[PDB]
Design a protein around this ligand. Structure first.
Ligand code: L53
Ligand code: UKW
Ligand code: ZN
Length: 300
């Protein structure tokens, strides 16, 4: 039987918050079956829990955040979340002594090593997948995103960029998901921003953790980062990293075909909620028989 997974041990890491620029300590903890993904703020007293849920997401100007019933927030969860999907973590408590998850290097990679340090513990309870069984499409102007039936997990992402430092042949990425493919082809792709906008935010006391160490920054014409890009198409690879993180907000791996044109956090989440809202568009499935398990969701 394909079992739910959690961490073997508690691990910690430090880093700066994108918003505050202050040092944030991140603590990852094992969690029992069926409890899912829980983000927790321990700076507040008492601590506040934010169960990962599609309905709780808000797409703020910088990255994303979760909210509780009083509109208290925890921000920048999507890159760590993406790593959770990549390494097949189902139940976990994620604590920060701050209002946000540390930005690290702007990618998911640093979270990969952290999770590997924590190890894997299988729990005696079947892992539930969300199997798409009807086509579901959402739109927003000339932007769209859809899920289609497909015995696997694939993502097909096209981004509309006109920036001189981003060539056209690098405005589409497509992959058949897997722990190994995520770790190698996606996890290291960094987030990115426009330098003048960042300068502005920081002059208003925002995005104070922003630096070359946590993002690809371009001006009107070029990449400013000394070493350049980790991939020629790092921008679109990161957009796919963000898609995986957005979709995993439901706490389950989805068996289906994801396609998106000019999509982002808002649209991805709108699709996620659209799928879950229609009862006949999806169903839970488990794998009592391991050989049944789609290629895409095999252990790392
Ligand atoms: C891609 C998505 O839209 C989105 N990215 C952000 O919202 C985002 C991206 C980059 C930054 C930044 C920065 C910086 C800097 C810097 C400051 C000073 C100096 N000297 C050099 C560099 C913030 C937010 C995101 O990835 N969401 O998941
Ligand atoms: C706070 C804030 C804030 C958020 C977004 C923008 C923005 O749209 N900047 C524009 C731009 O084209 N950026 O690439 C143009 C204006 O440069 C500017 C400021
Ligand atoms: Zn991102």
């Amino acid at each position: 039987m394909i079992k739910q997974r959690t961490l073997k041990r508690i691990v910690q890491a430090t880093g700066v918050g994108l918003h505050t620029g202050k040092k944030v300590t991140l603590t990852l903890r094992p969690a029992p079956a069926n409890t899912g993904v829980i983000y927790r703020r321990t700076d507040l007293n008492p601590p506040v829990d934010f169960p990962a849920d599609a309905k709780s997401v808000r797409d703020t100007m910088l990255c994303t955040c979760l909210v509780n019933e009083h509109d208290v927030r925890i921000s920048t969860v999507e890159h760590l979340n993406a790593a959770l999907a990549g390494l097949g973590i189902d139940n976990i408590v994620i604590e920060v002594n701050a209002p946000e998850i540390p930005i690290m290097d702007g990618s998911a990679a640093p979270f990969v090593y952290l999770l590997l340090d924590a190890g894997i513990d299988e729990l005696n309870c079947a892992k539930k997948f969300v199997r798409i069984k009807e086509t579901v499409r959402v739109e927003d102007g000339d932007k769209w995103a859809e899920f289609k039936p497909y015995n696997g997990f694939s993502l097909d992402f096209t981004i509309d960029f006109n920036h001189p430092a981003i060539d056209s042949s690098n405005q589409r990425y497509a992959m058949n998901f897997s722990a190994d493919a995520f770790m190698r082809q996606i996890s290291r792709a960094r987030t990115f921003g426009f330098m003048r906008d960042i300068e502005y935010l920081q002059s208003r006391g925002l995005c104070l953790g922003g630096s070359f160490d946590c993002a690809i920054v371009v001006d009107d014409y070029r990449v400013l980062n000394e070493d350049g890009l980790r991939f020629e198409d790092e921008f679109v690879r990161h957009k796919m990293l963000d898609a995986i993180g957005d979709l995993f907000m439901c706490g389950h791996n989805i068996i289906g075909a994801f396609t998106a044109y000019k999509s982002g956090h808002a649209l991805n989440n709108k699709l996620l909620q659209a799928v879950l809202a229609k009862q006949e568009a999806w169903e839970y499935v488990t794998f009592q028989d391991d050989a049944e398990l789609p290629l895409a969701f095999k252990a790392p």
